[PDB]
């Protein structure tokens, strides 16, 4: 048990092809993928919550079907977002946000009253954070923590998830051995990698992970 989520996150982070994205973008793993490696969701959730509380990771709302939470290392996010904002007009607002707000508040989102009254942000500074892509509107009174450049990641991720699921759907009886899937040529549209995508499919229960005497069989869950 101890270190299960931490080990899973580091294993999944190593799969991330960071060279595809904006310099601002830290490697992202999905809570769904952690569940592939730590299938006890109670354990996975408790240890991710501990890492969140101990400052080490940020949870980000990305809004996918099934598990829509991204996981990033806080220090990776901060380093890249700071470098990226250097000598842009939103740099001052972003520096204050990273230095004051992130350590004070571990939530996925921030309230307007919190930002303006507790932290002393001007509306124009909040607008800068939205322009920088560090905040996105959640509702009339709050903003999601966001990752600059995540739009490209979300686009690549959704197209790749559908393409990998299609590999299983196209196979005889809508099932495919893991070794057969991973040994296939990655379609052009799968930019984040087959293994990266398979962990998401297993954790999101878009495929069933069946133990056979031929190894792991991925099966569409039609029953």
In the complex, the residues that contact a second copy under the rule CB under 8 A are: 1-4, 6-7, 10-11, 51, 53-56, 63-66, 68, 74-75, 92, 95-96, 99-100, 102-105, 118-120, 130, 133, 136-140, 144, 146, 154-155, 158, 161-162, 165-166, 169, 174, 206, 220-223
Tell me the C-alpha to C-alpha distance, in Å, between residue 66 and each of 31, 71, 159, 188. 10, 15, 15, 24
Contact present, 34 and 203 (Cβ < 8 Å): yes
**Rounded to the nearest whole angstrom, what is the least distance from the CB of residue 53 to a second copy in the complex?**
6
Q: Applying CB under 5 A, which part among 44-52, 147-155, 162-170, 195-203 lies near Cl ion?
A: 195-203
In whole angstroms, how close is the CB of 202 to Cl ion at the nearest point?
A: 7
Question: How buried is residue 19: exposed, middle or buried, by Cβ count under 10 Å (0-12/13-18/19+)?
Answer: exposed
Look at residue 119 and give the partner it binds from a second copy, Cl ion, none, a contact being a CB closer than 5 to 8 Å depending on partner kind.
Answer: a second copy
Of the pair 6, 18, the CB lying nearest a second copy is at 6
208-212/142-145 β-pairing: unpaired
The entry of Cl ion, a second copy, none that residue 64 binds, CB within 5 to 8 Å by partner kind: a second copy
Rounded Cα gap, residues 181 and 193, in angstroms: 11
- In Å, what is the CA distance from 85 to each residue of 11, 116, 129, 131, 201? 29, 21, 10, 11, 35
Under the rule (CB under 5 A), what is the footprint of Cl ion? Answer: 17-19, 198
């Amino acid at each position: 048990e101890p270190g299960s989520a931490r080990a899973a996150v580091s294993e999944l982070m190593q799969l991330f092809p960071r060279g595809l994205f904006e310099d601002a973008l830290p490697p992202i793993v999905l809570r769904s993928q952690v569940y592939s490696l730590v299938p006890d969701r109670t354990v996975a959730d408790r240890q991710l919550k501990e890492l969140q509380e101990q400052g080490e990771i940020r949870i980000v709302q990305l809004g996918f079907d099934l598990d829509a939470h991204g996981i990033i290392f806080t220090e990776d996010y901060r380093t890249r977002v700071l470098k990226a904002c250097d000598g842009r007009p939103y740099a001052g607002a972003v520096q204050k946000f990273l230095a004051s707000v992130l350590p004070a508040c571990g939530d996925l989102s921030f309230q307007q009253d919190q930002m303006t009254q507790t932290f002393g942000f001007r509306d124009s500074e909040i607008t800068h954070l939205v322009n920088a892509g560090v905040l996105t509107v959640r509702d009339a009174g709050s903003w999601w923590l966001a990752v600059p450049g995540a739009g490209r990641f979300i686009k690549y991720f959704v197209k790749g998830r559908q393409a990998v699921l299609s590999m299983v759907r196209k196979a005889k009886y809508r099932e495919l051995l893991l070794s057969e899937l991973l040994g296939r040529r990655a379609p052009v549209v799968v930019r984040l990698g087959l293994t990266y995508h398979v962990h998401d499919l297993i954790g999101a229960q878009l495929v069933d992970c069946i133990s056979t005497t031929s190894g792991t069989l991925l099966r569409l869950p039609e029953t």
